[PDB]
Amino acid sequence: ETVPIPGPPGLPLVGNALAFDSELPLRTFQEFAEEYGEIYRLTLPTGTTLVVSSQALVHELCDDKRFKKPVAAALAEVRNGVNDGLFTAREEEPNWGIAHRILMPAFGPASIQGMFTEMHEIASQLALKWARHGPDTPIFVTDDFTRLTLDTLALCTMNFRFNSYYHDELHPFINAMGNFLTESGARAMRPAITSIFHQAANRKYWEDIEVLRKTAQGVLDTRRKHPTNRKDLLSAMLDGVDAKTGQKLSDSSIIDNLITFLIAGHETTSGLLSFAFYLLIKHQDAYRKAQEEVDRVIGKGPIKVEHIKKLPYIAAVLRETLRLCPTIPIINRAAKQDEVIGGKYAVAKDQRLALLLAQSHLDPAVYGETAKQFIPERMLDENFERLNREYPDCWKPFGTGMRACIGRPFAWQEAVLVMAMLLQNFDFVLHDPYYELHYKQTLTTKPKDFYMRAILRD
Numbered sequence: 001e002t003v004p005i006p007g008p009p010g011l012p013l014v015g016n017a018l019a020f021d022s023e024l025p026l027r028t029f030q031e032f033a034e035e036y037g038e039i040y041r042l043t044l045p046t047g048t049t050l051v052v053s054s055q056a057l058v059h060e061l062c063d064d065k066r067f068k069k070p071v072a073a074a075l076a077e078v079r080n081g082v083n084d085g086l087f088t089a090r091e092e093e094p095n096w097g098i099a100h101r102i103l104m105p106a107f108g109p110a111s112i113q114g115m116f117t118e119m120h121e122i123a124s125q126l127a128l129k130w131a132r133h134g135p136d137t138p139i140f141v142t143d144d145f146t147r148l149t150l151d152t153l154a155l156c157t158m159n160f161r162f163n164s165y166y167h168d169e170l171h172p173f174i175n176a177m178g179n180f181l182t183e184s185g186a187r188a189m190r191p192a193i194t195s196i197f198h199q200a201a202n203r204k205y206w207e208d209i210e211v212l213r214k215t216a217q218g219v220l221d222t223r224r225k226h227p228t229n230r231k232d233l234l235s236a237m238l239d240g241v242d243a244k245t246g247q248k249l250s251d252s253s254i255i256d257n258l259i260t261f262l263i264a265g266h267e268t269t270s271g272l273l274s275f276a277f278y279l280l281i282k283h284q285d286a287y288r289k290a291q292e293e294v295d296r297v298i299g300k301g302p303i304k305v306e307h308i309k310k311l312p313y314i315a316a317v318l319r320e321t322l323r324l325c326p327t328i329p330i331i332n333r334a335a336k337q338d339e340v341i342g343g344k345y346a347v348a349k350d351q352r353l354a355l356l357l358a359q360s361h362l363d364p365a366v367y368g369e370t371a372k373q374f375i376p377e378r379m380l381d382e383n384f385e386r387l388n389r390e391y392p393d394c395w396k397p398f399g400t401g402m403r404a405c406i407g408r409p410f411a412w413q414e415a416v417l418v419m420a421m422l423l424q425n426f427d428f429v430l431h432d433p434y435y436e437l438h439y440k441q442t443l444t445t446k447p448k449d450f451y452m453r454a455i456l457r458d
């Protein structure tokens with residue numbers, strides 16, 4: 001049966017670890033995928049990784065009966081900061097289930113619509129900031145979208161205001177987070193032989209984790225000092241009991257999950273919006289269609305919750321953005337038993353399989369010779385539903401199975417509302433007409449050094 005898996009030749013002691021660009025490891029992953037195809041091997045410090053780049057293999061690996069999220073590589077290091085909180089717990093750790101069952105109802109459609117008013121407030125703060133600063137002020141796109149997503153997440157779920165639009169600098173949490181995530185990846189790639197030369201990076205890693213724990217302590221202290229009668233993520237964490245186990249979250253776990261949601265609940269949405277606005281600006285055809293949609297559906301009147309599902313082109317723009325720019329570009333699967341995939345590839349129990357979504361999402365077999373182009377038309381409901389029927393798991397930016405994104409509907413309502421609001425009131429242009437998209441990677445991806453200007457409409 002089984003064919004040998006190719007891969008870049010390793011070196012003694014280091015395997016292929018030192019091939020990874022410190023600042024943009026995703027590039028290394030995708031260049032190897034271009035060179036060796038749908039599957040290749042890496043020898044890294046945490047074990048032999050297999051890197052799957054094709055929709056055929058990604059779909060098989062999305063079978064929850066045969067595979068599971070292991071929490072390996074970078075995610076395993078992220079446990080240093082958030083332990084067995086919802087994102088970094090292993091499936092056999094009872095705290096995954098306790099947290100899952102207690103927190104799931106906060107993201108039900110009823111609750112998400114309930115948060116629309118507060119999402120709309122934070123979006124308005126951003127709109128007014130840009131309106132008031134006028135058309136000559138360069139906007140640091142990722143900075144203002146991080147402010148929006150952090151403030152939206154914290155207000156709607158924890159009833160906490162960072163008030164990021166009142167402060168020149170981002171809250172210390174944001175830098176601590178970026179370095180904690182980057183260094184978590186770096187640690188998992190660091191070969192035994194070299195590790196001793198990283199003591200400065202190590203002191204800093206634990207200091208940045210302390211900032212995360214302190215910030216979450218601050219959110220929890222605010223709720224204790226100013227109790228509220230509303231139901232939200234944090235009231236669920238404090239009061240919620242799991243029917244199945246009869247348990248509530250420990251304070252240790254409340255801090256773990258608060259950090260988890262502060263990160264997962266804003267970082268990737270700031271990426272989505274930052275990439276989406278780069279792509280709309282660069283693709284004037286799509287810019288016009290998205291503007292034309294907002295004008296016909298919403299016009300100059302208020303954006304209400306009903307409008308979120310009445311903006312199909314904006315939905316398509318976000319879907320297409322997440323296809324080319326999945327802001328978590330790799331998810332991990334591991335086989336529950338020794339296994340064979342594409343009926344020719346030997347795969348060991350618990351062996352780390354990297355689903356390189358940044359490549360699976362360009363599979364020519366699914367998306368054709370236009371795969372690398374930005375075409376929102378591609379991901380309109382009719383064609384999107386067709387691609388999912390004919391090529392299941394062709395598009396997985398929100399992960400897979402019982403370990404898929406709990407926050408998807410929050411992110412979606414936020415991204416659609418913000419994009420509608422901004423296109424309604426503003427036109428957008430590159431600050432540098434010669435800007436070429438570069439990536440900043442903190443495990444997650446965003447545009448780097450992307451500035452634009454906002455001109456109010458008439």
Ligand code: HEM
Pocket residue numbers: 069075086087100153260261264265266268269272326327328331332396397398399400402403404405406407408410411
């Ligand atoms: C555009 C925005 C977002 C993207 C692309 C995204 C993507 C993902 C992905 C891929 C996973 C799976 C990780 C894995 O398989 O290892 C995931 C899980 C998760 N996401 Fe999101 N996400 C987004 C927004 C959010 C938001 C807004 C929240 C919370 C309010 C959130 C909370 C989570 C949590 C808690 C998990 C862990 C769930 C579990 O495994 O039990 N994310 N997300």
Ligand SMILES: CCCCCCCCCCCC(=O)O
Pocket residue numbers: 072073074075078087181185188260263264328329330331443444
């Ligand atoms: C708490 C939220 C953190 C999000 C994790 C994103 C990880 C993707 C990068 C994987 C790279 C690797 O481990 O080789």
